[PDB]
Design a protein around this ligand. Structure first.
Ligand SMILES: O=C1CCCN1Cc1ccc(-n2nc(C(F)(F)F)c3c2CCCC3)cc1F
Ligand SMILES: N[C@@H](CCC(=O)O)C(=O)O
Ligand SMILES: N[C@@H](CCC(=O)O)C(=O)O
Ligand SMILES: [Zn+2]
Ligand SMILES: [Zn+2]
Ligand SMILES: [Zn+2]
Ligand SMILES: [Zn+2]
Lengths: 262, 262
């Protein structure tokens, strides 16, 4: 039947989506800016739909509760029919691919280490071989599941530590992890995606840094509910944006053009 | 009905598929080795099929003739029903995605520059601003189409040069491009995928090198004909291999463990 306004689920995560200063009482999509705001506009333009940006209600990426089996976060909003599409730094994973559809990736990333400058840590192996410096991840996302599932000896040992460390090494939001690194005088390191890490490293007060290689190699994808009418066209649009150089332009706009650290 | 042996199309391209020394008169899959031989074995194991490796008849990746509209290469073998699956360093592109299905990527890569050591070239911009050093690409693949289509000013200018340069700057196989770099005393540079470039840079006689950043950012995917019964299971298998660390193991086996240049 008639076209409907597509409900887009996304998450307040710098530099992907941020509320514009003093727009708290304005209306609609114009309230937000960032990489995924720009990406949403292009994907809608190429696919021919109108859309509304909405912030995921529970502030989470998406994980399945072990007991209840209920999906939360943006994945949940797609699975239970609360949104039509997720346009966010949402990691393509097997367990998610089983319940929702992903486009081809629009970014690359890997899990990485953030330290406060001067922290004597250069690698995951370094972190795993000491106990003075605490370390954790975001509490309900793909990074935590990576450690939970890994059979690689260094990551397995890291998980054995994190899962029972006190106080909890896990955080609710990327911002909380970053703030914890910055206030802990070097006694907390944060495990997060390289994209987020590299962004923060170029933001004032310029006191964090990415160290070592990425622990893995994966992508973000645009997600739709299984059997969505949008999935095919969205996939082709991602490839077009890739080949036209648009995804590279948006990366350079929101990371490197935004740099504050010289 | 009953399961059939899956016909796999692939291409002789180091280190993805190579004929084992002195096996020219042996039979079957045991004749071949390499990254994509190992990947094929895992994808078949996870998906529960038997398979035969075959080398694409025309030795090409896959492009659509502008006049006849016929697809050649591995893409053609899928489009005309000559193979069931392509497991090769086959680039995910829009024009291909329109006629065949790709899995999520199993590698990353970008177009890159190979020079003979000592060549005074550090970038695509350098190449584009001079005429003493010739440069080209593989004649029937995604790199050539990248230059043909680009509207980025440096790449557009490079394409204007390559398309009418004499003798032809284009080559039939990656090996021919590499040999041309090595014999040209620095007067030919070769535009090829970073994966291939980085492999060759660690092989004797250790006289080539990758220079500058990648020009783009994309992936290889496993390809199946549209409506194949294999596509879904193959996609999920790629994600599993990614998350289990298997794709990283295979990369380190065929690139860095294979290094000859110290
Ligand atoms: O190592 C592995 C195996 C599992 C995934 N991954 C890393 C990885 C991440 C992203 C990309 N792609 N692919 C494409 C494309 F669809 F081809 F256009 C693009 C990207 C990066 C973003 C722009 C386009 C490719 C990758 F290989
Ligand atoms: N991108 C992650 C969230 C960030 C993280 O887990 O590090 C996800 O989709 O779950
Ligand atoms: N991977 C390329 C071939 C190599 C190249 O074009 O540089 C393709 O799929 O067409
Ligand atoms: Zn405004
Ligand atoms: Zn566009
Ligand atoms: Zn043998
Ligand atoms: Zn396996």
């Amino acid at each position: 039947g008639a076209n409907k306004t597509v409900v887009v689920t996304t998450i307040l995560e710098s530099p992907y989506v941020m509320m514009k200063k003093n727009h708290e009482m304005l209306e609609g999509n114009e309230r937000y800016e960032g990489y995924c705001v720009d990406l949403a506009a292009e994907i809608a333009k190429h696919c021919g739909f109108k859309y509304k940006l909405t912030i995921v209600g529970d502030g989470k990426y998406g994980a399945r509760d072990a007991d209840t089996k209920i999906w939360n976060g943006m994945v949940g909003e797609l699975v239970y029919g609360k949104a039509d599409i997720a346009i966010a730094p949402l990691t393509i994973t097997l367990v998610r691919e089983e319940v929702i559809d992903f486009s081809k990736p629009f970014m690359s990333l890997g899990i990485s280490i953030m330290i406060k400058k001067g922290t004597p840590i250069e690698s995951a192996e370094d972190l795993s071989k000491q106990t003075e410096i605490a370390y954790g991840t975001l509490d309900s996302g793909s990074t935590k599941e990576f450690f939970r599932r890994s059979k690689i000896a260094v990551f397995d040992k890291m998980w054995t530590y994190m899962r029972s460390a006190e106080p909890s090494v896990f955080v609710r939001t990327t911002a909380e992890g970053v703030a914890r690194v910055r206030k802990s005088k070097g006694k907390y390191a944060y495990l997060l995606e390289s994209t987020m890490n590299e962004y923060i490293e170029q933001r004032k007060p310029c006191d964090t840094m990415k160290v070592g290689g990425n622990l893995d190699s994966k992508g973000y994808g645009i997600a739709t509910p299984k059997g969505s009418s949008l999935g095919n066209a969205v996939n082709l649009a991602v490839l077009k944006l890739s080949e036209q150089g648009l995804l590279d332009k948006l990366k350079n706009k929101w990371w490197y053009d935004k740099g504050e650290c010289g």
